[PDB]
Amino acid sequence: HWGYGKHNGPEHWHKDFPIAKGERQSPVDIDTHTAKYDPSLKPLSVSYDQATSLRILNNGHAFNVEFDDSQDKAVLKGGPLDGTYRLIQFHFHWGSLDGQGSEHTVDKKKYAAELHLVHWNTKYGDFGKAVQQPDGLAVLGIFLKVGSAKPGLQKVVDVLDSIKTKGKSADFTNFDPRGLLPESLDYWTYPGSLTTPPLLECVTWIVLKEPISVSSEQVLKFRKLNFNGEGEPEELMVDNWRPAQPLKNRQIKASFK
Numbered sequence: 001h002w003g004y005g006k007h008n009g010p011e012h013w014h015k016d017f018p019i020a021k022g023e024r025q026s027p028v029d030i031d032t033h034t035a036k037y038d039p040s041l042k043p044l045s046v047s048y049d050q051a052t053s054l055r056i057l058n059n060g061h062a063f064n065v066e067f068d069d070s071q072d073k074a075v076l077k078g079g080p081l082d083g084t085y086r087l088i089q090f091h092f093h094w095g096s097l098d099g100q101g102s103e104h105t106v107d108k109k110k111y112a113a114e115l116h117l118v119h120w121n122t123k124y125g126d127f128g129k130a131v132q133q134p135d136g137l138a139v140l141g142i143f144l145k146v147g148s149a150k151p152g153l154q155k156v157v158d159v160l161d162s163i164k165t166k167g168k169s170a171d172f173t174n175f176d177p178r179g180l181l182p183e184s185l186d187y188w189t190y191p192g193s194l195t196t197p198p199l200l201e202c203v204t205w206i207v208l209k210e211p212i213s214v215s216s217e218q219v220l221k222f223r224k225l226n227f228n229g230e231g232e233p234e235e236l237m238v239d240n241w242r243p244a245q246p247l248k249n250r251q252i253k254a255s256f257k
């Protein structure tokens with residue numbers, strides 16, 4: 001099926017998923033001098049105090065830390081968002097080298113990786129229904145640069161050995177996503193899509209201005225994961241990012257000057 005290699009990668013997706021060439025695809029390049037400051041944007045509210053993590057899973061495309069979303073335990077509100085969006089999982093995209101890995105770019109600059117915290121609009125009742133709506137999801141995107149270690153990331157790094165290959169999962173309770181946030185919540189926002197098949201155009205993207213720093217040793221451990229399942233030839237899980245798509249008829253708004 002689909003992947004990130006020469007023969008099944010982003011260039012090929014449109015054949016099974018024609019929406020790949022659609023009206024509001026992600027990610028995009030964020031041209032910082034074209035984005036418009038919008039004073040009508042309310043403050044962004046990230047309420048992760050009661051967050052309940054459950055499990056970490058290698059699905060062959062990335063790894064996901066999954067959350068109990070049966071109640072309003074961890075929610076995103078405010079900013080460009082109307083209503084309440086519940087945290088369902090977070091995952092990362094990263095590169096084979098420190099100079100690439102992010103999905104969004106900032107004035108064409110690629111970061112070593114990108115963290116995505118996926119939330120769904122509670123008005124639609126469940127995640128499956130939400131992805132069929134133009135305002136069904138809100139994904140908070142955070143850039144990673146290589147520098148000093150991120151303490152809040154280490155617990156994730158430590159468990160990757162136990163989910164090396166496709167299909168593996170491990171218990172991952174009591175993880176606090178607040179430890180992955182930068183100091184500032186300044187952001188850009190635009191309407192877009194999922195960055196993997198089925199590429200549904202259901203996402204309000206909120207991308208933070210301030211990157212978090214992770215150590216080279218930390219990102220190196222991401223690159224030791226496998227796309228393949230156990231007992232198959234090793235294909236390192238690296239460069240699992242879609243490149244920037246055309247902005248087309250969209251405007252990127254900024255929460256800051």
Ligand SMILES: CC(=O)O[C@@H]1[C@@H](O)[C@@H](O)O[C@H](COS(N)(=O)=O)[C@H]1OC(C)=O
Pocket residue numbers: 059061062063064089091116118139193194195196
């Ligand atoms: C659970 C799962 O497969 O999560 C996916 C995940 O593991 C990854 O490949 O990234 C995908 C796209 O999400 S993104 N980049 O925020 O648009 C995910 O799809 C979905 C639907 O969340």
Ligand SMILES: [Zn+2]
Pocket residue numbers: 091092093116195
């Ligand atoms: Zn993602």
